[PDB]
Motif scaffolding. Structure first.
Motif, PDB file in Angstrom:
ATOM      1  N   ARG A   4       6.895  52.488  21.151  1.00 18.99           N
ATOM      2  CA  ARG A   4       6.287  52.387  22.786  1.00 18.99           C
ATOM      3  C   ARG A   4       7.219  52.277  23.963  1.00 18.99           C
ATOM      4  N   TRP A   5       7.478  53.343  24.343  1.00 17.94           N
ATOM      5  CA  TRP A   5       7.859  53.828  26.025  1.00 17.94           C
ATOM      6  C   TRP A   5       7.999  52.756  27.391  1.00 17.94           C
ATOM      7  N   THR A   6       8.560  51.812  27.204  1.00 20.74           N
ATOM      8  CA  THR A   6       7.962  51.462  28.849  1.00 20.74           C
ATOM      9  C   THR A   6       8.853  52.281  29.984  1.00 20.74           C
ATOM     10  N   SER A   7       7.856  52.388  30.659  1.00 23.92           N
ATOM     11  CA  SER A   7       7.810  53.300  32.177  1.00 23.92           C
ATOM     12  C   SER A   7       9.318  53.576  32.687  1.00 23.92           C
ATOM     13  N   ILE A  39       8.048  47.578  20.486  1.00 24.58           N
ATOM     14  CA  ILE A  39       8.663  48.444  22.608  1.00 24.58           C
ATOM     15  C   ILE A  39       9.604  49.025  22.374  1.00 24.58           C
ATOM     16  N   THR A  41      13.268  48.859  25.303  1.00 26.77           N
ATOM     17  CA  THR A  41      12.752  49.011  26.987  1.00 26.77           C
ATOM     18  C   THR A  41      14.493  49.694  27.177  1.00 26.77           C
TER      19      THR A  41
END
Length: 62
Positions: A4-7, A39, A41
């Motif tokens: 999961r790549w954060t914005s 995820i 960061t």
């Protein structure tokens, strides 16, 4: 397959040179597994970008 790549991480990945983006992505997601996080960061993204910066000072010889 992917994590999961954060914005922010997505934006950080874009700041990385295209030639080494696949390279960096592999590092970043592996770093996430080193932390056992699903995820990633922008901090992980930076880490991969920084490590490549440290190991490459252009003139890799004397």
């Amino acid at each position: 397959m992917n994590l999961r790549w954060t914005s922010e991480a997505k934006t950080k990945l874009k700041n990385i040179p295209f030639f080494a983006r696949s390279q960096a992505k592999a590092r970043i997601e592996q770093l996430a597994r080193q932390a056992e996080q699903d995820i990633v960061t922008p901090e992980l993204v930076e880490q991969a970008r920084l490590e490549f910066g440290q190991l490459e000072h252009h003139h890799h010889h004397h």
